[PDB]
């Protein structure tokens, strides 16, 4: 049918290290001879509310760093602050460094998170980057520096490093250039996330999953152009629709054009009348096209 399919973690687990400095123990990522982690590892609860970063840096003496990979204990050569992460160089090059790149995920794109605590992976979950540049994850104290990642071929694209839980219950963090998604920052101050859009190409994708799973009751003979939908979408809580090869491929598989599904969306927005789609009553937008596709075609 369809599920939130998480990527396998074996390439990623051996890169998970703990990092400690003074009081704080959190998580970091070890690739080649670099360990990445949130820069706030150098705060105690005391600066912890509004920390002074540029100033914390100065008092930093290397030996106070402590980086465990299992029982092993890497020794830190040098270190730099890049945006909201620390990039610490270690002497030992990581023997299990996967082939990898760094990237950046956009609203609607999905990825896997490997949640860790104290350097030790605990489990993993599939998430969607929202309009507000936050995700709906599951994170306790000690989770920071948990990594989000996507598998593209023979390669790992690192994409998220976990840092902040907002007052609304959703999460956000930095990409691997040390930069935060959206307007958020590493301080325990009020940060209201902006409004969220329903991720339209995601909904379309789930609607194709539905068709493919013999549930097409909503498919009718009205049609809506992407031009007219977009105009409408602004006004009604939907992200803009953009050309998408996977949807094109889903339109091929099923016979049902994108435009047919735009109409269904405008109708369904008036409510479902307790009819269900894939055991659900709301729009589902947590699955990307490539997710439904991978799963239903391969």
């Amino acid at each position: 049918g369809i599920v939130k399919m998480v990527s396998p973690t074996s390439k990623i687990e051996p890169c998970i290290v703990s990092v400690t400095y003074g009081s704080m123990t959190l998580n970091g990522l070890w690739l080649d001879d670099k360990v990445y982690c949130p820069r706030h590892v150098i705060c105690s609860s005391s600066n912890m509310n509004e920390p002074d970063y540029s100033a914390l840096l100065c008092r930093v003496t290397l030996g106070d760093f402590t980086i465990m990979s299992g029982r092993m204990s890497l020794t830190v050569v040098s270190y730099q602050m890049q945006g909201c992460q620390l990039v610490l160089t270690v002497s030992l090059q990581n023997p299990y460094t996967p082939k990898y790149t760094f990237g950046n995920v956009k609203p609607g794109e999905t990825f896997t998170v490997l949640a860790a605590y104290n350097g030790r992976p605990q489990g993993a979950f599939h998430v969607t980057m929202r309009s507000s540049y936050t995700i709906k994850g599951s994170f306790l104290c000690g989770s920071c520096g948990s990594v989000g990642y996507v598998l593209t071929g023979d390669s790992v694209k690192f994409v998220y490093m976990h840092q902040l839980e907002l007052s609304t219950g959703c999460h956000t963090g930095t990409d691997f250039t040390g930069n935060f998604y959206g307007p958020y920052r590493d301080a325990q101050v009020v940060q209201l996330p902006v409004k969220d859009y329903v991720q339209t190409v995601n909904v379309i994708a789930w609607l194709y999953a539905a068709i493919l799973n013999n549930c097409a009751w909503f498919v009718q003979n009205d049609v809506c152009s992407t031009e007219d939908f977009n105009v409408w979408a602004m006004a009604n809580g939907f992200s803009q629709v953009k050309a998408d090869l996977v949807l094109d491929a889903l339109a091929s598989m099923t016979g049902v054009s994108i435009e047919t599904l735009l109409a269904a969306i405008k109708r369904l927005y008036m409510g479902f009348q307790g009819r269900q789609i894939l055991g659900s009553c709301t729009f589902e937008d947590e699955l990307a096209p490539s997710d439904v596709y991978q799963q239903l075609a391969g």
Partner: peptide
Amino acid sequence: XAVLX
């Protein structure tokens, strides 16, 4: 406030 993990 927000909370740092």
